[PDB]
């Protein structure tokens, strides 16, 4: 209902695609391990949807 409030977050944090977002999620959730799109998808699915 107030889209101009989220614009600050979008600007100061940058934009992501699906694959880039998944890679970032893997990077921050599992430090050290090599990032992978399928891996991050697996963490998301096993976390909030299984």
């Amino acid at each position: 209902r107030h889209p101009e409030y989220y614009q600050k977050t979008i600007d100061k944090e940058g934009q992501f695609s699906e694959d880039e977002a998944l890679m970032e999620l893997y990077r921050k959730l599992r430090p050290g391990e090599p990032p992978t799109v399928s891996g991050g998808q697996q963490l998301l699915e096993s976390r909030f949807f299984d």
Binding site: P31, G32, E33, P34, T36, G39
Partner: protein
């Protein structure tokens, strides 16, 4: 060939199960080109029983590790690390960034001289 030898840490008394499960998984996944052969080296040694006779039974030379010949790639690493009764690879440990617990272990192959020595 880029297939190198690595050592994998497994559970106690769970090496035959790990070998069978890993070979079955790699066969059923059609990934036999990445992972070639797994092994548990053994050696028969005198095993003197109640009397003076030696049973000469086989015992493991590395009780707790299994050897794997494979090409180290990301996907094959993912399949290997997901096998049950497998703790982690053997290599160079790394410092955990934040919090407690273990870090990330970078695998390291056995040198040609060593792998020659173990394999007679």
């Amino acid at each position: 060939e880029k297939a190198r030898w690595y050592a994998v840490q497994v559970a106690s008394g769970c090496e035959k199960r790990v070998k069978a499960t890993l070979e079955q998984r790699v066969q059923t996944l059609d990934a036999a080109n990445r992972i070639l052969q797994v092994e548990i080296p053994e050696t028969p040694i005198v095993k003197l029983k109640k009397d003076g006779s030696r049973q000469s039974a086989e015992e493991k030379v590395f009780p707790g590790y299994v050897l794997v010949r494979m090409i180290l790639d990301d996907d094959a690493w993912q399949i290997v690390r997901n096998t049950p009764h497998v703790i982690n690879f053997v290599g160079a440990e790394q410092k955990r960034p934040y919090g407690r617990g273990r870090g990330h272990v970078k695998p390291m192959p056995l040198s040609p001289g060593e792998v020659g020595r173990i394999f007679k």
